[PDB]
């Protein structure tokens, strides 16, 4: 029954390089991790300076 569902949701394109899209998604995840880490890092440093004078 699973084979029929996968056939029903089959993309009419080359199935070999479907993981190249995943590699590009991993590059986007790299960018997202860059954003996350830098943002939180200097936000935490600002929180540190906030508690210092506080």
């Amino acid at each position: 029954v699973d084979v029929d569902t996968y056939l029903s949701n089959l993309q009419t394109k080359t199935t070999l390089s479907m993981i190249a899209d995943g590699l590009e998604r991993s590059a986007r995840d790299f960018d997202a991790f860059l954003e996350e880490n830098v943002t939180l890092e200097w936000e935490a440093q600002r929180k540190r300076i906030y508690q210092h004078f506080g």
């Binding site: 699973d2 084979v3 996968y6 056939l7 089959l10 080359t14 199935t15 070999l16 479907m18 993981i19 995943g22 590699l23 991993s26 590059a27 995840d29 790299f30 997202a32 991790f33 860059l34 954003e35 996350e36 880490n37 830098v38 943002t39 890092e41 200097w42 440093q45 600002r46 929180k47 300076i49 906030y50 210092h52 004078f53 506080g54």
Partner: protein, 1645 residues
């Protein structure tokens, strides 16, 4: 212990097709062809080594003899697969109708069932196929098509599936199996007896084993036993009796429905065929024992059967069987002659032979007398031999009256001689016997029109040779017998039939006997020597044939040369002008001897017979003086070519004598050259021949010049006006040019440059002008074929020329233009081949073969230093064929269509092997030519090709060609693979083939070369399928998939047992079916998964780390490629599993067999550049003209991994062979070096392919290993990838051709996987090891962000960034990490920042700048640098980063857009200011003033600044203002806040618009904006107490803030109204936004 298990496989295997029965047809084919791969294949080898097969081939009747074996049949047919019912029914019906054993009928029906597809494919084309071939032909013009009464393919199939047609096919297969069994035994006989030497080792072993086992004939004994071999003759003679009986009576129990005209003709032809082959077997058996007699009882029985059947004439009366009559008549007459062996008969009776049995004598006499009185000519030789025998017997007894006496007295021949003299006279009268002997010799000769093979032909010629031998003396020298013997020896051959092939020593006896035995040598050889030149034919043909037949015989290689250089006798007609130059001797009146009295100067240094020479007037004169006849003939040719008459000289050469002389000269030159180039032969033999032919001629003119002037003089006029003799002279001259081409190319090319035959710019060309509708009969076809072959040899010599001197008097331009004009002429001939009326289809076949081969060579070298030598001709051909106009396209394609039609319409025959070989040769040549043309059209880039459609339409013929003959399988599928490959870059295939046709082709293709299990055929068919999938033939693939799947799976069940060459292709196709058609195969994959995964595990865990150390050192390439294919196979299925979410276990199991790839997969460690460098050194120092890279393949064909890959060994073999030492001694030299080097690079290519396949594989595996458990496996994986990158990115040392992609994909994989783990938060704290090396790698590149290396620099900096991120996620302290991180970050940030500023002074650059800033902060956040702040400040002070940043943030402004560079610059400054030391340095550098004087501040001052503002300028301004100032303000106030509070307050009071607007709309990053503003105001309010001058007024209305934030404090739903983040919201952004709000609310209370 002699079973039929091997002779016929079990029933279920027969029906399923798993195993194909080794029918007698395929055995006969493999034997007649003597194909090594076929005969030595396991299946056929075992079949031939079977004792049961031995027994039946010894007793032929057992194959079809009717015995009662119900037991066997019932046991074989019972208990097995539905369908056995019809097979059993047909088998029993056949056994009862033909009256044979049931096993034979069963196997016949099984053969028919297995060949159902072939039978359906061979039937005439259907309506759709007819229309397709018509469209392919075209309207413009004689195709001679089949009738249009053919029904639709559907009706044809429905009639095919009936019972009547199935029974007809079964009967046809039975008859064909009779014929094929007899032919197979004949071929086996001649393969055992007279196989040529130098035979392959395994084939010689098979031959010896057959001999020993089946015949007790062990060559390991001095004199092996031949009894079992001699027992054949009588058995097959009885079989011939049975066959002549069958031919006169049809099967009784068969119904008249099957007894139709076609079936009757088939039965008679089958009987005649088996009779012929049995007679061949018997004649071989009797030829083995040349010098001894045969038993008299066998002779009696044979001659009685002859008398009854008039020597097989009773069945050869019809006309449709003449093709089988001439051969059978020749063979039976010859075997009778053989039995007699007159030589020894008449030797014996003057010095048990059948002469001691008057019964046998009476039998022979009555048979001969009946055959003579009847009056058929096929019996004349036997009758003449018997007449001579009886004559000698009569003399013998007459000398006794002063057992055969009983015979003579019984036939009343004791005292009268006229009874035998009458037969003798009638046999010799009008040369009847001699003419039929010549005919028998032609059909028994070495030519391509002979009926039997060459060997049987030679022995059959020997018998007639002996007859003429013993009849010579009693009948004077005459034209009839001498011409008969000349035809016996020559067999109507030509110059092109010359060759240095080594045949069985026994097979040259017909030729050596001329100089071995006395009678012949004295009566005919010496006689022709004596009559020359008066009789030119006798001596000319003798020398012409012997020079070619003695090429390999070293003892007699000098006799022709000695006769020509040293001839003892001479004979010429007497010119009255010499009446004053002689005087009689007066010794005997009849002798008529005389002596010369003067110097007779023939042609009156010159040719003169000195004074006082002896001579004789026999009727013409003969002088016995030693001289050189070669120079004489050369001078005669010179004279007749110069048209110079000589009254006082001898008679000139006539047209016929002229042609024969030129032909002989050409042949002798060719033979001399051939045996000179042979090992040991005097290499200067052809040159000496040319010299002696040029002797006593004009000083500087040579025989070659004579031929040149003759050609010129006769081509003065046009070709059509020239008569037959002159055309033959021109053909002989062309043959002489071809012969001379080898030893003196220079001269030949220099002549061809200005030859009128060839088209030129001056005159169009005489050869080009004879095109039209004239008939190409012998006279003209000889010339045409000779010219075409000369052109082919010219192309060959041009392509094989890498460089006193062979190439003299020629130059590049000469070669080029001659080649262009030769291509033009060849194209003209190929065009005119359509309308010409050839003598027969065989001439057309030969001509098309030769011309297509020439054009194919041109295309091949078209494919680059010396390509220009002949590039214009190749360009001409390819342009004429790939983009011609419509009429041109149709007329250029017509010959190919005709070739296909002739190919599959001509019936298969077991005789005339030469014709079949030539036809198959032209078929394969046209197929490969079309393939090469399609390859060229695809490469060069011409898309609109008419040949494409012409072939797609002719697919009806291509798909059926394999059914007519199996040899076409390979080239047909190569061509069709190319046809779909050039089109994939869509066309329909069934629309042309058809449902039934396509299905039958599918089934025939299924089970690739199952009988023989060969490698090349397998590979071709599998690559064909793979390319079929890869060119998007979506319909045919889907149809053929439904048990080829199971076939491939079963092939892959035992990969270790099967060859690697086989495996790489099969699995390439599996990959091509998986990637492009995943859903159909994944179900089947599930079905065979256990077995398949097992095998893949084994192959992948073989892990041979040092391929070269292990025995399979040169087989490392196929190993690496199959490994890469296995990886690519498992990878995509595991990715689909990831998508299926059931991968958690399959990945954990798969990860255990990745060691091979872990060790050397990502790394491309093994290149060994040193070897390629030394190869280049050698080739360069030994050859200044040519360089190493000149042999690089142009990817013209689909580059094939194998013996030759990067370097084209195929062409080097011929080009670099001209020089000695290239091959070397004991396989040592440069050839070996090229082989090893191209193999190393082959596996290097496969290695890069594996890099890509593993790039694919590892990723979905790591993604399937995301769950927390099994951390050790993924730890191993990340560890191994960082290790491989570490050791691969450095000391790579690759070629810089295909390494571009590697340099980037390596870094890509690294960063991707490292970030994946970073997401899992399971990386170890100690990453300093790789960090140091990655810094080294970034320092290795020579130009930072260079145009060529910019992508690489970007990716490497991203890798360093993520590695720093991972590093600071550690606790090094509760070689040191701190110093390493410090140094590397210092160098990189400083250098990159300042260089980027420099170039961007005046997009990729600001993106990289953002990345640099990110790296700066990521490294500043490391726990170990807070304690070394001073050093960061120190080295940030050394390099003026501060000044350049402050400079370029104000890069460009207008004064009373959007600031991007400013944004990034002050972001960099803020991250430098993160800790208070650099913040203090910035505060002390008056940074505030610098950015306040800049106009980015002026833009910030305007009122349109907003968080989500209308223009990107204002939005950028909001973001930059906030980020750059507010956090930086607090960071600088951290240090000495009391001192710099004035400056912060002043910069805040300078711009109040934002201060007001922000708080107004607070009444989303505005949260942090007001947070920072509130903190700053609250701290500076407290600091304001000390000094009023500082912070004069706060100018901040923070009262609104404590109410604003409180209104959004308690509303969960209200809080998500105006929240829109630039970064992804993803458990909610609320969680942290409200946290900031809480943090801000309290302080200001």
């Amino acid at each position: 212990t002699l079973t039929d298990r091997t002779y016929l496989p079990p029933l279920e295997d027969c029906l399923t097709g798993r195993t194909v029965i080794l029918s007698w047809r395929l055995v006969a084919s493999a034997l007649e062809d003597a194909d090594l791969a076929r005969l030595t294949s396991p299946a056929l080898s075992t079949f031939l080594r079977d004792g049961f097969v031995h027994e039946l081939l010894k007793h032929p009747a057992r194959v079809f003899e009717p015995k009662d074996l119900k037991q066997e049949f019932e046991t074989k047919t019972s208990s097995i697969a539905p369908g056995v019912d019809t097979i059993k029914k047909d088998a029993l019906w056949l056994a009862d109708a033909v009256a044979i054993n049931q096993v034979a009928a069963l196997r016949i029906v099984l053969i028919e069932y297995q060949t159902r597809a072939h039978s359906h494919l061979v039937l005439p084309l259907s309506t759709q196929d007819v229309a397709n071939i018509q469209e392919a032909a075209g309207v413009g013009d004689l195709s001679l098509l089949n009738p249009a009464s053919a029904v639709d393919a559907e009706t044809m199939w429905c009639d095919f599936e009936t019972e009547a047609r199935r029974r007809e096919r079964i009967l046809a297969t039975y008859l064909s199996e009779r014929r094929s069994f007899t032919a197979a035994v004949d071929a086996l006989v001649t393969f055992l007896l007279h196989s040529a030497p130098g035979q392959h080792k395994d084939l010689d072993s098979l031959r010896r084993a057959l001999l020993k086992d089946a015949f007790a004939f062990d060559e390991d004994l001095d004199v092996p036993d031949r009894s079992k071999l001699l027992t054949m003759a009588p058995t097959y003679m009885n079989l011939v009796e049975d066959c002549i009986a069958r031919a006169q009576a049809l099967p009784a129990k068969l119904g008249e429905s099957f007894k139709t005209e076609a079936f009757e003709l088939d039965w008679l032809r089958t009987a005649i065929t088996e009779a012929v082959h049995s007679l061949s077997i018997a004649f071989q058996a009797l030829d083995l024992d040349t010098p001894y007699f045969a038993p008299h009882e066998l002779l009696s029985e044979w001659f009685e059967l002859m008398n009854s059947s008039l020597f097989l004439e009773s069945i050869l009366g019809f006309e449709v069987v003449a093709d089988l009559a001439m051969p059978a008549r020749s063979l039976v007459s010859a075997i009778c002659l053989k039995m007699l062996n007159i030589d020894r008969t008449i030797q014996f009776l003057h010095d048990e032979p059948y002469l001691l049995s008057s019964q046998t004598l009476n039998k022979i006499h009555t048979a001969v007398t009946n055959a003579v009185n009847s009056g058929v000519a096929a019996s004349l030789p036997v009758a003449f031999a018997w007449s001579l025998i009886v004559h000698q017997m009569h003399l013998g007894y007459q000398e006794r009256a002063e057992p055969y006496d009983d015979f003579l007295r019984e036939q009343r021949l004791d005292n009268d001689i006229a009874p035998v003299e009458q037969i003798a006279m009638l046999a010799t009268s009008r040369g009847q016997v001699y003419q039929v002997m010549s005919e028998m010799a032609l059909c028994l000769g070495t030519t391509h029109e002979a009926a039997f093979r060459p060997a049987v032909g030679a022995r059959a010629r020997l018998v007639f040779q002996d007859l003429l031998k013993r009849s010579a003396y009693l009948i004077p020298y005459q034209d009839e017998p001498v011409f008969s013997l000349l035809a016996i020896l020559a067999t109507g051959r030509q110059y092109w039939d010359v060759t240095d092939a080594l045949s069985a020593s026994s097979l040259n006896q017909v030729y050596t006997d001329m100089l071995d035995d006395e009678t012949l040598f004295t009566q005919f050889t010496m006689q022709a020597i004596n009559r020359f030149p008066y009789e030119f034919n006798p001596f000319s043909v003798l020398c012409r044939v012997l020079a070619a037949a003695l090429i390999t015989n070293k003892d007699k290689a000098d006799v022709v040369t000695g006769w020509l250089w040293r001839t003892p006798t001479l004979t010429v007609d007497w010119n009255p002008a010499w009446d004053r130059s002689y005087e009689l001797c007066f010794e005997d009146e009849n002798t008529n001897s005389f002596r010369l009295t003067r110097d007779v100067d023939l042609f009156g240094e010159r040719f003169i017979i000195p004074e006082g020479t002896l001579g004789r007037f026999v009727t013409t004169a003969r002088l016995e003086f030693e001289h050189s006849a070669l120079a004489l003939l050369g001078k005669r040719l010179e004279v007749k070519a110069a048209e110079e008459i000589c009254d006082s000289g001898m008679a000139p050469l006539d047209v016929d004598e002229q042609a024969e002389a030129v032909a002989m000269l050409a042949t002798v030159l060719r033979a001399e050259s051939l045996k000179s180039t042979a090992k040991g032969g005097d290499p200067e033999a052809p040159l000496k021949f040319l010299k002696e032919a040029s002797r006593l001629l004009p000083h500087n003119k040579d025989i070659l010049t004579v031929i040149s002037d003759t050609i010129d003089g006769l081509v003065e006029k046009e070709l059509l006006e020239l008569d037959g003799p002159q055309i033959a002279v021109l053909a002989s001259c062309l043959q002489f040019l071809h012969a001379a081409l080898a030893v003196c190319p220079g001269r030949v090319w220099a002549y061809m440059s200005r030859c009128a035959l060839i088209a030129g710019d001056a005159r169009p060309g005489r050869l080009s002008r004879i095109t039209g509708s004239l008939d190409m009969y012998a006279e003209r076809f000889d010339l045409l074929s000779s010219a075409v072959k000369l052109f082919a040899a010219l192309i060959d010599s041009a392509a094989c020329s890498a460089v006193e001197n062979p190439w003299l008097g020629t130059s590049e331009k000469i070669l080029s233009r001659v080649a262009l004009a030769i291509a033009q002429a060849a194209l003209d001939v190929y065009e005119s081949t359509t309308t010409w009326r050839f003598r027969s289809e065989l001439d057309r076949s030969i001509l098309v073969r030769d011309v297509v081969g020439l054009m194919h060579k041109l295309v091949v070298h078209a494919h680059s230093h010396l390509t220009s030598t002949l590039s214009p001709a190749a360009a001409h051909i390819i342009s004429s064929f790939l983009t011609p106009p419509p009429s041109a396209s149709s007329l250029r394609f017509q010959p190919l269509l005709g070739t296909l039609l002739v190919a599959l319409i001509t019936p298969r025959a077991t005789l005339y092997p030469g014709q079949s070989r030539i036809l198959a040769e032209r078929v394969t040549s046209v197929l490969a030519f079309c393939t090469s043309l399609l390859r060229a059209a695809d490469f060069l880039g011409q898309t609109h090709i008419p040949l494409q459609t012409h072939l797609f339409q002719s697919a009806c013929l291509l798909a059926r060609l394999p059914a007519a003959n199996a040899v076409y399988r390979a080239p047909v599928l190569e061509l069709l693979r190319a046809l779909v490959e050039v089109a994939g870059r869509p066309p329909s295939l069934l629309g042309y083939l058809g449902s039934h046709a396509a299905r039958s082709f599918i089934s025939l293709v299924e089970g690739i070369d199952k009988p023989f299990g060969r490698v090349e055929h397998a590979v071709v068919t599998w690559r064909f399928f793979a390319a079929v999938i890869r060119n998007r033939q979506q319909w045919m693939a889907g149809c053929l998939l439904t048990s080829v799947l199971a076939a491939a799976m079963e092939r892959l069940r035992e990969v270790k047992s099967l060859d690697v060459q086989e495996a790489v292709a099969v699995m390439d196709f599996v990959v091509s079916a998986q990637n492009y058609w995943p859903w159909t195969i994944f179900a089947v994959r599930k079905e065979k998964e256990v077995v398949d995964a097992l095998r893949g595990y084994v192959r992948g865990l073989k892990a041979p780390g040092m391929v070269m150390k292990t025995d399979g050192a040169a087989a490392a390439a196929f190993q690496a490629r199959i490994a890469a294919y296995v990886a690519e196979t498992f990878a995509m299925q595991l990715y689909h599993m990831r998508q299926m979410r059931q991968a958690e276990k399959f990945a954990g199991e798969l990860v255990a067999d990745l060691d091979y790839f872990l060790r050397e997969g990502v790394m491309v460690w093994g290149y060994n550049a040193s070897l390629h460098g030394n190869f280049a050194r050698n080739f360069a120092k030994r050859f200044p003209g040519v360089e190493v890279d000149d042999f690089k393949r142009t990817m013209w064909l689909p580059r094939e991994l194998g013996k030759g890959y990067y370097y084209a060994l195929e062409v080097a073999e011929q080009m670099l062979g001209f020089d000695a030492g290239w091959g070397g001694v004991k396989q040592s030299g440069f050839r070996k070096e090229m082989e090893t080097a191209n193999l190393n690079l082959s596996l290097v290519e496969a290695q890069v392919s594996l890099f890509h396949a593993w790039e694919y594989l590892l990723l979905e595996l790591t993604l399937s290993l995301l769950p927390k458990k099994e951390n050790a496996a993924f730890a191993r994986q990340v560890l191994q990838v960082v290790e491989q990158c570490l050791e691969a990115n450095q000391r790579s040392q690759p070629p810089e051709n295909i390494f571009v992609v590697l340099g980037h994909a390596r870094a890509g994989l690294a960063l991707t996987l490292l970030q994946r783990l970073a997401d899992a938060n399971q990386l170890p704290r100690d990453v300093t090891h790789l960090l140091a090396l990655v810094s080294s790698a970034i320092h290795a590149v020579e130009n930072p962000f260079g145009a060529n290396d910019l992508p690489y620099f970007r990716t490497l900096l991203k890798i360093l960034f993520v590695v720093l991120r991972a590093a600071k996620q550690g606790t090094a302290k509760p070689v040191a990490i701190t110093q390493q991180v410090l140094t590397i970050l210092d160098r990189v940030v400083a250098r990159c920042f300042r260089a980027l500023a420099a170039l961007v002074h005046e997009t990729t650059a600001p993106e990289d700048l953002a990345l640099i800033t990110a790296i700066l902060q990521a490294c500043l956040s490391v726990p170990g640098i807070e304690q070394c702040q001073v050093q960061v400040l120190n080295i940030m002070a050394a390099h003026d980063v501060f000044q350049v940043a402050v400079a370029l943030f104000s890069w460009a402004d207008r004064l009373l857009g959007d600031p991007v560079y400013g944004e990034l610059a002050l972001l960099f400054l803020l991250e430098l200011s993160a800790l208070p030391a650099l913040a203090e340095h910035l505060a002390c550098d008056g940074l505030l003033g610098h950015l306040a004087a800049a106009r980015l501040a002026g833009y910030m001052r305007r009122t349109n600044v907003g968080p989500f503002a209308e223009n990107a300028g204002a939005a950028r301004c909001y973001a930059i203002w906030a980020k750059c100032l507010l956090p930086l303000l607090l960071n600088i106030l951290a240090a000495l806040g009391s001192t710099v509070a004035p400056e912060v307050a002043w910069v805040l009071n300078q711009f109040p618009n934002l201060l007001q607007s922000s708080v107004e709309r607070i009444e989303l990053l505005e949260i942090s904006e007001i947070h920072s503003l509130a903190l700053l105001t609250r701290v500076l309010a407290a600091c304001r107490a000390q000094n009023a001058r500082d912070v004069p007024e706060v100018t901040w209305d923070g009262a609104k803030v404590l109410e604003c934030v409180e209104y959004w404090l308690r509303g969960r739903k209200v809080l998500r109204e105006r929240l829109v983040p630039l970064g992804p919201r993803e458990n909610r952004l609320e969680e942290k936004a409200v946290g900031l709000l809480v943090g801000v609310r309290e302080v200001l209370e």
